[PDB]
Design an enzyme around this catalytic site. Structure first.
Site, PDB file in Angstrom:
ATOM      1  N   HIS A   1       7.949   1.069  -3.867  1.00 56.60           N
ATOM      2  CA  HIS A   1       7.550   0.143  -2.811  1.00 56.60           C
ATOM      3  C   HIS A   1       5.856   0.431  -2.802  1.00 56.60           C
ATOM      4  O   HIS A   1       5.310  -0.216  -1.964  1.00 56.60           O
ATOM      5  CB  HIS A   1       7.992   0.506  -1.678  1.00 56.60           C
ATOM      6  CG  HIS A   1       7.962   1.923  -0.822  1.00 56.60           C
ATOM      7  ND1 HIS A   1       8.544   2.952  -0.813  1.00 56.60           N
ATOM      8  CD2 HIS A   1       6.721   2.259  -0.173  1.00 56.60           C
ATOM      9  CE1 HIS A   1       8.037   3.885  -0.158  1.00 56.60           C
ATOM     10  NE2 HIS A   1       6.874   3.627   0.322  1.00 56.60           N
TER      11      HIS A   1
ATOM     12  N   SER B   1       4.404   8.032   0.848  1.00 58.28           N
ATOM     13  CA  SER B   1       5.017   7.427  -0.141  1.00 58.28           C
ATOM     14  C   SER B   1       5.026   7.960  -1.533  1.00 58.28           C
ATOM     15  O   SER B   1       3.984   8.106  -2.060  1.00 58.28           O
ATOM     16  CB  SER B   1       4.962   6.045  -0.163  1.00 58.28           C
ATOM     17  OG  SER B   1       5.154   5.479   1.182  1.00 58.28           O
TER      18      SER B   1
ATOM     19  N   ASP C   1      14.129   2.948  -5.572  1.00 56.42           N
ATOM     20  CA  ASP C   1      12.941   3.129  -5.060  1.00 56.42           C
ATOM     21  C   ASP C   1      12.144   3.992  -6.097  1.00 56.42           C
ATOM     22  O   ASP C   1      11.602   5.302  -5.601  1.00 56.42           O
ATOM     23  CB  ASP C   1      12.651   3.652  -3.697  1.00 56.42           C
ATOM     24  CG  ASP C   1      11.156   3.344  -2.880  1.00 56.42           C
ATOM     25  OD1 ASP C   1      10.521   2.525  -3.534  1.00 56.42           O
ATOM     26  OD2 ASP C   1      10.883   3.920  -2.009  1.00 56.42           O
TER      27      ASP C   1
HETATM   28  C1  LIG Z   1       1.632   1.015   0.004  1.00 60.68           C
HETATM   29  C2  LIG Z   1       3.280   1.076   0.666  1.00 60.68           C
HETATM   30  C3  LIG Z   1       2.966   0.811   2.345  1.00 60.68           C
HETATM   31  N1  LIG Z   1       3.897   1.663   2.823  1.00 60.68           N
HETATM   32  C4  LIG Z   1       5.307   1.146   3.303  1.00 60.68           C
HETATM   33  O1  LIG Z   1       5.581   0.402   2.968  1.00 60.68           O
HETATM   34  N2  LIG Z   1       5.953   2.347   3.853  1.00 60.68           N
HETATM   35  C5  LIG Z   1       7.266   1.731   3.989  1.00 60.68           C
HETATM   36  C6  LIG Z   1       8.635   2.205   3.371  1.00 60.68           C
HETATM   37  N3  LIG Z   1       9.023   1.528   2.649  1.00 60.68           N
HETATM   38  O2  LIG Z   1      10.276   1.977   1.952  1.00 60.68           O
HETATM   39  C7  LIG Z   1      10.869   1.234   1.153  1.00 60.68           C
HETATM   40  C8  LIG Z   1      10.912  -0.378   0.999  1.00 60.68           C
HETATM   41  C9  LIG Z   1      11.517  -1.019   0.124  1.00 60.68           C
HETATM   42  C10 LIG Z   1      12.600  -0.359  -0.466  1.00 60.68           C
HETATM   43  C11 LIG Z   1      12.677   0.997  -0.443  1.00 60.68           C
HETATM   44  C12 LIG Z   1      11.834   1.718   0.326  1.00 60.68           C
HETATM   45  N4  LIG Z   1       8.757   3.436   3.233  1.00 60.68           N
HETATM   46  C13 LIG Z   1       7.930   4.740   3.444  1.00 60.68           C
HETATM   47  C14 LIG Z   1       6.733   4.486   4.432  1.00 60.68           C
HETATM   48  C15 LIG Z   1       6.480   5.808   5.266  1.00 60.68           C
HETATM   49  C16 LIG Z   1       7.420   6.790   5.810  1.00 60.68           C
HETATM   50  C17 LIG Z   1       8.067   7.552   5.351  1.00 60.68           C
HETATM   51  C18 LIG Z   1       8.867   8.634   5.752  1.00 60.68           C
HETATM   52 CL1  LIG Z   1       9.515   9.846   5.163  1.00 60.68          CL
HETATM   53  C19 LIG Z   1       9.251   8.309   7.042  1.00 60.68           C
HETATM   54  C20 LIG Z   1       8.851   7.236   7.763  1.00 60.68           C
HETATM   55  C21 LIG Z   1       8.144   6.249   7.364  1.00 60.68           C
HETATM   56  O3  LIG Z   1       7.388   5.337   7.655  1.00 60.68           O
HETATM   57  C22 LIG Z   1       7.582   4.585   8.786  1.00 60.68           C
HETATM   58  C23 LIG Z   1       5.617   3.598   4.064  1.00 60.68           C
HETATM   59  O4  LIG Z   1       4.402   4.095   4.034  1.00 60.68           O
HETATM   60  C24 LIG Z   1       2.013   1.391   3.146  1.00 60.68           C
HETATM   61  C25 LIG Z   1       1.645   0.760   4.194  1.00 60.68           C
HETATM   62  C26 LIG Z   1       0.672   0.901   5.232  1.00 60.68           C
HETATM   63  C27 LIG Z   1      -0.233   2.034   4.951  1.00 60.68           C
HETATM   64  C28 LIG Z   1      -1.206   2.541   6.198  1.00 60.68           C
HETATM   65  O5  LIG Z   1      -2.081   3.245   5.786  1.00 60.68           O
HETATM   66  O6  LIG Z   1      -1.212   1.804   7.010  1.00 60.68           O
HETATM   67  C29 LIG Z   1      -0.052   2.650   3.667  1.00 60.68           C
HETATM   68  N5  LIG Z   1      -1.002   3.773   3.286  1.00 60.68           N
HETATM   69  C30 LIG Z   1       1.041   2.459   2.873  1.00 60.68           C
END
Ligand SMILES: CC[C@@H](NC(=O)N1C/C(=N/Oc2ccccc2)NC[C@@H](Cc2cc(Cl)ccc2OC)C1=O)c1ccc(C(=O)O)c(N)c1
Ligand SMILES: *[C@@H]1O[C@H](CO)[C@@H](O)[C@H](O)[C@H]1NC(C)=O
Ligand SMILES: *[C@@H]1O[C@H](CO)[C@@H](O)[C@H](O)[C@H]1NC(C)=O
Ligand SMILES: [Zn+2]
Length: 218
Positions: free
Chosen positions: A45, A174, A89
């Site tokens: 992701h 992540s 993932d």
């Molecule tokens: C680059 C990826 C992006 N992050 C992001 O999407 N997520 C959501 C995410 N998506 O996971 C998926 C998606 C599809 C398939 C499998 C897993 N995963 C984790 C997450 C952060 C997180 C981790 C944990 Cl342990 C608990 C809650 C939580 O978020 C509410 C995240 O960054 C992102 C979005 C926003 C920021 C920011 O700084 O605002 C950032 N540094 C990074």
């Protein structure tokens, strides 16, 4: 990282800071870790149009001689990566050069127990990313504790973090490694948008065959 403390600088020299570029918006970031001099492991992701890796960093806003900024030439996302079920993932990033091995940069080779996760992510629900690498210890939970995530699957994933505590990975963490007795056992994958633990981590051991096949053919 929520509820953690600042890492001793350079004490986790495999940690990678990833800056992710997309075409339609501003940069984002994730963690990851160096498993070979030219390969970083992270979450799928975190994929994007292009990615730059910083190795050797502590305070990511203060450039230093330990830094190695490397270009990623190719992203290998797991072919079954599924954004509906959130399975598989996991992603390898091939670096344009092999990293230098220094004191600040090095590789990391391969329920109930305490493990440690590290990252530059947000330190609070409404807080910015941390300037400095932070870390926290988290309990491995029985799979029952992650039932409320409907697509959780104990074969593929780890259930991480005691619900009675506020310690958690969050946004920007992540892809970071979960270390148990010095071995990488998981990667930060997802959790609740309010950070209440537990969270779901990718179970590295299930993907070893797939890791080996990419590393051998590149
Ligand atoms: C680059 C990826 C992006 N992050 C992001 O999407 N997520 C959501 C995410 N998506 O996971 C998926 C998606 C599809 C398939 C499998 C897993 N995963 C984790 C997450 C952060 C997180 C981790 C944990 Cl342990 C608990 C809650 C939580 O978020 C509410 C995240 O960054 C992102 C979005 C926003 C920021 C920011 O700084 O605002 C950032 N540094 C990074
Ligand atoms: C990180 O480095 C910057 C620029 O030197 C400094 O302002 C900041 O306080 C440092 N942050 C820490 C140690 O949290
Ligand atoms: C994701 O997994 C679901 C449920 O197994 C499946 O039906 C779907 O086609 C998979 N692939 C994508 C791209 O969603
Ligand atoms: Zn330093």
């Amino acid at each position: 990282i929520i509820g953690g403390t600042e890492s001793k600088p350079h004490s986790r020299p495999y940690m990678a800071y990833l800056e992710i570029v997309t075409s339609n918006g501003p940069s984002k970031f994730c963690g990851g870790f160096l498993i070979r001099r030219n390969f970083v492991l992270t979450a799928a992701h975190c994929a994007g149009r292009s990615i730059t890796v910083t190795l050797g960093a502590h305070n990511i806003t203060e450039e230093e001689d330990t830094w190695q900024k490397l270009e990623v030439i190719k992203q290998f996302r797991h072919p079954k990566y599924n954004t509906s079920t959130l399975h598989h993932d996991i992603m390898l990033l091939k670096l344009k050069e092999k990293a230098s091995l220094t004191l600040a940069v090095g590789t990391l080779p391969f329920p109930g127990r305490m493990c440690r996760v590290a990252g530059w992510g947000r330190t609070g629900v409404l807080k910015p990313g941390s300037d400095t690498l932070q870390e926290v210890k988290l309990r491995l939970m029985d799979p029952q504790a992650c039932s409320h995530f409907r697509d959780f699957d104990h074969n593929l994933q780890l259930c991480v973090g005691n619900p009675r505590k506020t310690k958690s990975a969050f946004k920007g963490d992540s892809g970071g490694p979960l270390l148990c007795a010095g071995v990488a056992q998981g990667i930060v994958s997802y959790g609740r948008s309010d950070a209440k633990p537990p969270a779901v981590f990718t179970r590295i051991s299930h993907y070893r065959p797939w890791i080996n096949q990419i590393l051998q053919a590149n």
